[PDB]
């Protein structure tokens, strides 16, 4: 019985050390989250003309695949785990959307081991920002320079949108190709302004004034707004990571607690049972010695 109680004691100490370690992770992530939440007050304003430029009606997939030749899907994953279902849900969405003409350039280490085992050939590489220095416009420029290795016809930038501390949903930016964007710009600048989808904005004057703009400046307009889109995606996934890690750490601490209470109950149970066992042993050996005493008179002469 000594081995059992020693084992349970070692498991108790292991769970306690594991608990304080996870608590330390929680404190670090809390510091980073309290930094990054300052962005939440200030976001939701920079991409509005980008929307107006790049957004289109919801195009069904199966027509986009036949229309296109080499799509692109950029999943923005994390550098380290204990996040939750963000990475797994991104992978699930892509294996839901998997089609013969795709190519995946990701962002994060966790897109490196997972996707390559699900997507053998479509997955190409990834991009890694060691988050010592906050993301930048030139990080998104790096990502654009990586995406442009392909002659892609559409780029679906997947990311996690931080609706709240308990709400980190998925989100997509469907970026067109430059030549296709320019052709659609002309074809929609000619005709009158009529929205074809609720929630979408008319931008015919913008699609004329861009025609007033020279060619190199329009290419710069496209690249600049796509860069801002990528940057908003990276920032939102950073915040979503740091917000979902807290949830996926407090639940770990709850599980660790429960394991610790079970370990404590079993340790104390084994302790008491061992005490009773040693007691009954001693009383048994003593009782046997008492039983080995005769009741005979053993009479002898006293004179």
């Amino acid at each position: 019985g000594g081995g059992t109680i020693r084992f349970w004691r070692e498991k108790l100490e292991g769970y306690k050390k594991y608990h304080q370690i996870v608590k330390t992770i929680k404190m670090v992530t809390l510091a980073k989250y309290r930094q990054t939440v300052v962005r939440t007050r200030v976001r939701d304003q920079t991409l509005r003309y980008t929307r107006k430029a790049l957004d289109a009606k919801t195009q069904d997939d199966q027509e986009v695949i036949e229309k296109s030749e080499c799509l692109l899907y950029v999943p923005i994953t994390t550098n380290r785990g204990s996040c939750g279902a963000l990475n797994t849900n991104m992978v699930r969405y892509l294996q839901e959307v998997e089609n013969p003409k795709m190519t995946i350039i990701s962002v994060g280490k966790k897109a490196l081991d997972a996707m390559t085992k699900v997507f053998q050939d479509t997955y190409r590489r990834t991009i890694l920002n060691d988050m010592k220095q906050a993301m930048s416009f030139q990080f998104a420029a790096y990502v654009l320079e990586h995406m442009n290795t392909v002659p892609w016809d559409r780029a679906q930038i997947v990311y996690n949108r931080y609706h709240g501390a308990a709400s980190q949903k998925l989100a997509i930016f469907n970026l067109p190709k430059f030549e296709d964007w320019k052709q659609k710009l002309e074809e929609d600048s000619a005709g009158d302004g009529k929205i074809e989808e609720d929630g979408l904005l008319q931008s015919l004057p913008m699609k004329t004034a861009l025609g007033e703009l020279e060619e190199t400046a329009v290419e710069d307009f496209y690249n600049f707004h796509s860069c801002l889109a990528v940057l908003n995606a990276v920032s939102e996934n950073e915040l979503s990571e740091y917000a979902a890690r807290i949830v996926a750490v407090e639940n770990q601490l709850g599980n660790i607690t429960g394991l610790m209470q079970l370990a404590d109950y079993t340790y104390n149970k084994t302790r008491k049972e061992l005490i009773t066992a040693e007691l009954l042993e001693i009383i048994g050996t003593m009782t046997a010695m008492h039983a080995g005493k005769k009741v005979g008179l053993k009479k002898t002469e006293f004179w």
Partner: protein
């Protein structure tokens, strides 16, 4: 019987004061027979014997919600069912604190009224679904 867990302590006093050979968890070893003599007397008698009845609702005190105690298993090994009340649900406002998963009636389906039998089948399906749908999400 409120409660058989204390009857066993009294018999443990009687035995250890007589220096009888103890057993698991300090009990002599005949405490199973002690409760079985009592619980087997509770029966539904045959029409040959009057078709009478003697129901028994014994009570037993667990420790930190541990059904793996000696007396608890000794009584579950005798009784025709189990009603497991949980301190967690009791402190959580649910009163009676019956845990349906850890509870069962091995025989009462034959006695249950049909009007109650149908409602019980429906609620059993509903709660078997509810126990899973509540845990599978884990606040996801």
């Amino acid at each position: 019987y409120d409660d058989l867990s204390k009857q066993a302590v009294s018999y443990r006093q009687i035995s250890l004061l007589l220096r009888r050979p103890p057993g698991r968890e300090a009990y002599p070893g005949d405490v199973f027979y002690l409760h079985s003599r009592l619980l087997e007397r509770s029966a539904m008698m045959s029409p040959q014997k009057g078709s009478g009845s003697l129901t028994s609702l014994p009570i037993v005190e667990t420790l930190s919600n541990d059904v793996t105690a000696y007396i608890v298993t000794n009584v579950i090994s005798i009784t025709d069912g189990q009603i497991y009340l949980d301190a967690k649900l009791f402190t959580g406002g649910q009163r009676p604190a019956v845990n349906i998963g850890l509870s069962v009636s091995r025989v009462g389906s034959s006695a249950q009224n049909k009007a109650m039998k149908k409602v019980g089948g429906a609620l059993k399906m509903l709660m078997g679904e509810y126990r899973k749908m509540a845990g599978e999400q884990t606040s996801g």
